[PDB]
Amino acid sequence: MDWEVERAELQARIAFLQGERKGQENLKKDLVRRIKMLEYALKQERA
């Protein structure tokens, strides 16, 4: 029809965004770890 074809498009959009969303989230997870890794390294270099 005309109203149900748009709903599938909308669902497809939400599906794609969801996949990308997860990656980005657990990418930030690694980034913070890296700052922690650098923090610790700096802490050792002062000693």
Partner: protein
């Protein structure tokens, strides 16, 4: 803590399912190496990256790129020689862009080896790659020869020369292609005695190979070799190979010489060019394959001005112009357009008189060609001959061709020239029109084919859109108004159609004063179809504001307000008011 040891961090980033999160891990490997320092980057990071990594193309490419930059992060150039094992692993992988990124990184960190350790660790790497079982190593080694040769001892220069010689007589065509490509890059770092001793034999051997893929890439390196030899010994060694390459049975090789022809000419100077290279150009323009002919045709202007000036004109007339005379009526729509793009530049090279006598028939022939690229490429480069010949001597010699294919039987041809009329008026200028053209545009308006008339009214619109309301008012508007009122009633309708499309570019004053009185006079005509389009016409004008005279438009509009006439008039008056 134990979970922040950068090695453990990189590991736990590498057990990710997603590849983008391992790619963004290896792309920031600079950070891991910098956090470990330089002692542990060598102690554990490089051993880790050398053997353990087996992943997709995208990751290994970034790993090669990163290893390319790790010189400072590894301890400086005294310790650079440890970046070699993992980049060596990467220089043999199956995916090709990773091999080539690793080779680029190796050539980059070559400069960081001091000659003493260059001989020690970097050259045995090139040896190992040049002798590997599977050929990918050998193509990488071909990449690695040129960079390290010059700054190494003379004995190992000889050894490297031997290993490269071995690579050029390889069994697999892939290795032979690689070496053939890198032949010029290697020749540039050799001493001249070794260029004649070692390079020119390998050059002739590759250019006389069984596969065409390698002959193709050896005639490529020919231009680098010819630039490294003096013009005297140049004839003996390079010219047998080059002449047999120009007559090779594979059109790919002949295409390569045609392509690098304007460069080969500058490489061998102007003497050997005059002797053997010009006839090779001639029979390359008469080549049996079309795609070679087009590549040669592109190189005519670049070739002509780059001639010995004394013999340049004599040789151009005697040797190159007949071949153009036949190339203008070639069969392939690509050779023709390729020569059409560049043949115009032959006009300042020959002079006004020689251009008139020998070049104008060729440009006028390629103007009447049916292909649109040939015609457009000819018109695009008209200033090139406009400055050599003059606007009068030029307009007077093409006008016959414009009128020739203006009165041509095929309606397609007439439409083709109405198409290019305004951009051919961009370079003819505001003047040097009028004459019998304006007459051509009017004869277009009286044409039988409707497409021609529609394109010609839409042509008058763009033709005053480039010269001005003043010019239109001076020369076009009278010829248009003269047509309104004549026996054949269809011409009155076409007059009003062009008046409609014409009012879209001229300010209110010029459109009002001269278009309204004769639109209304011809509107008083008995025929109903002419008045019908009169009403439809005043509708579209309207919009150009007339306000004070708009009303004076509404009153005769009500006077006219046979059923079709009334439909159009009522619709116009409703929309206008």
């Amino acid at each position: 803590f134990d979970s922040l040891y950068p090695i453990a961090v990189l590991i736990d980033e590498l057990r990710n399912e997603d590849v983008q999160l391992r790619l963004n891990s290896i792309k920031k490997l600079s950070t891991i190496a910098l956090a470990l320092g330089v002692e542990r980057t060598r102690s554990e990071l490089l051993p880790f990256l050398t053997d353990t990594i087996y992943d997709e193309d995208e990751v290994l490419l970034a790993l090669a790129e990163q290893l390319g930059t790790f010189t400072t992060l590894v301890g400086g150039p005294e310790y650079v020689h440890c970046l070699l094992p993992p980049l060596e692993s990467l220089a043999t992988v199956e995916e090709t862009v990773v091999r080539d990124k690793a080779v680029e990184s190796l050539r980059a960190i070559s400069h960081e080896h001091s000659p003493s350790d260059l001989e020690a660790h970097f050259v045995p790497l090139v040896k190992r790659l040049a002798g590997g079982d599977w050929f990918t190593s050998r193509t990488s080694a071909c990449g690695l020869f040129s960079v390290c040769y010059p700054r190494v001892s003379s004995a190992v220069k000889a050894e490297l020369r031997q290993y490269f010689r071995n690579l050029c007589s390889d069994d697999t065509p892939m290795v032979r292609r690689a070496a053939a490509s890198k032949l010029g890059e290697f020749a540039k770092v050799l001493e001249l005695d070794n260029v004649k001793s070692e390079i020119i034999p390998m050059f002739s051997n590759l250019a006389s190979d069984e596969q065409d893929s390698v002959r193709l890439l050896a005639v490529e390196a020919c231009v680098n070799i010819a630039q490294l030899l003096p013009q005297e010994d140049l004839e003996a060694l390079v010219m047998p190979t080059l002449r047999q390459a120009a007559e090779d049975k594979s059109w790919r090789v002949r295409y390569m010489v045609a392509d690098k022809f304007t460069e080969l000419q500058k490489a061998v100077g102007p003497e050997i060019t005059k002797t053997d290279l010009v006839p090779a150009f001639q029979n390359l323009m008469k080549d049996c394959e079309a795609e070679v002919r087009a590549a040669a045709s592109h190189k005519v202007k670049e070739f002509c001005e780059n001639l010995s000036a004394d013999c340049r004109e004599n040789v151009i007339m005697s040797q190159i112009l007949p071949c153009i005379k036949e190339l203008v009526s070639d069969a392939n729509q690509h050779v023709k357009s390729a020569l059409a793009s560049v043949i115009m530049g032959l006009s300042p090279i020959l002079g006004k008189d020689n251009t008139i006598e020998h070049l104008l028939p060729l440009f006028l022939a390629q103007l009447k060609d049916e292909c649109p690229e040939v015609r457009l490429n000819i018109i695009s480069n008209l200033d090139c001959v406009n400055e050599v010949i003059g606007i009068r001597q030029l307009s007077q010699s093409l006008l016959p061709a414009i009128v020739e294919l203006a009165e041509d039987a095929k309606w397609r041809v007439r439409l083709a020239i109405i198409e290019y009329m305004p951009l051919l008026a961009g370079q003819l200028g505001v003047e040097f029109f009028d004459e019998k053209l304006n007459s051509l545009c009017m004869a277009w308006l009286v044409d039988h084919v409707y497409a021609i008339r529609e394109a010609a009214t839409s042509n008058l619109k763009k033709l005053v859109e480039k010269f001005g309301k003043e010019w239109a008012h001076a020369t076009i508007i009278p010829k248009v108004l003269a047509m309104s009122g004549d026996p054949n009633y269809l011409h009155r309708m076409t007059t009003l159609f062009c008046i409609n499309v014409l009012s879209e570019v001229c300010g209110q004053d010029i459109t009002t004063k001269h278009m309204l009185p004769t639109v209304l006079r011809m509107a008083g005509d008995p025929v109903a179809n002419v008045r019908f389009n009169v009403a439809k016409s005043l509708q579209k004008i309207g919009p150009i504001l007339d306000n004070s005279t708009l009303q004076s438009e509404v009153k005769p509009i009500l006077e006219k307000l046979d059923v079709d006439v009334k439909y159009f008039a009522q619709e116009a008056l409703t929309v206008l008011s």
